[PDB]
Design a protein around this ligand. Structure first.
Ligand SMILES: Nc1nc2c(ncn2[C@@H]2O[C@H](COP(=O)(O)OP(=O)(O)NP(=O)(O)O)[C@@H](O)[C@H]2O)c(=O)[nH]1
Ligand SMILES: COc1cccc(-c2ccc(Nc3ccc(C[NH+](C)C)cc3)c(OC)c2F)c1
Ligand SMILES: [Mg+2]
Length: 171
């Protein structure tokens, strides 16, 4: 019996400065943050309609700048889907994607975890990671790829809605 809308727990991960907070704030508040305020841990919530189902997104915005924590491994255990964010103007953040995915596969103890690869800052000219390289990486993991800009709002909704669609396929 129906007790309230379905709830989805999403975690946004990736290197420091790629725009994990900017994406989330752009989703919740329709606001671009220009200042860079390093995050330890922040939680958000938004109601949306995706494919005709109303649902509640519980979103955890993580830190990039983290050494081993057991607080960290706890939220990777509870979270049902992951946005893996890199910045298209920072090749190191792209190479770090592999580390985030391994860390997740290890704690969930599973090959098949709902994920979306997100290449942020596609508004900047400084592109050092090619769209094709990222699509290939995503195809090799069997997951979707979305190019976003927290500044222009391109792909922001799509990134979160796509993740929810992946979580739905998984069950
Ligand atoms: N041009 C442009 N700048 C962006 C974009 N996304 C974020 N930024 C900028 O990049 C900086 C870092 O954004 P922020 O959201 O703090 O990154 P983060 O991944 O949350 N950082 P942290 O991991 O330390 O919490 C900020 O100045 C922000 O304005 C984007 O899509 N385009
Ligand atoms: C521990 O791991 C995760 C992984 C992914 C998501 C959440 C999560 C993230 C957010 C909320 N809930 C929440 C979010 C924002 C507020 C803000 N407040 C001012 C209304 C309150 C509750 C939540 O509650 C059940 C959450 F569970 C937790
Ligand atoms: Mg952040």
């Amino acid at each position: 019996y129906f007790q309230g809308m379905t709830e989805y727990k999403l975690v946004v991960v990736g290197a420091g400065g790629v725009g994990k907070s900017a994406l989330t704030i752009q989703l919740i508040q329709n606001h671009f943050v220009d200042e860079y305020d390093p995050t330890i841990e922040d939680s958000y919530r938004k109601q949306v309609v995706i494919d005709g189902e109303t649902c509640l997104l519980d979103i955890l915005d993580t830190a990039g700048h983290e050494e081993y924590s057991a607080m960290r491994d706890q939220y990777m255990r509870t979270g049902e889907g992951f946005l893996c964010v890199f910045a298209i103007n920072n090749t190191k953040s792209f190479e770090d994607i592999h580390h985030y995915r391994e860390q997740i596969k290890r704690v969930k103890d599973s090959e098949d975890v709902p994920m979306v690869l997100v290449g942020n800052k596609c508004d900047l000219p400084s592109r050092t990671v090619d769209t094709k390289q990222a699509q290939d990486l995503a195809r090799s993991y069997g997951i979707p790829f979305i190019e976003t800009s927290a500044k222009t709002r391109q792909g922001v909704d799509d990134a979160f809605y796509t993740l929810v669609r992946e979580i739905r396929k998984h069950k």
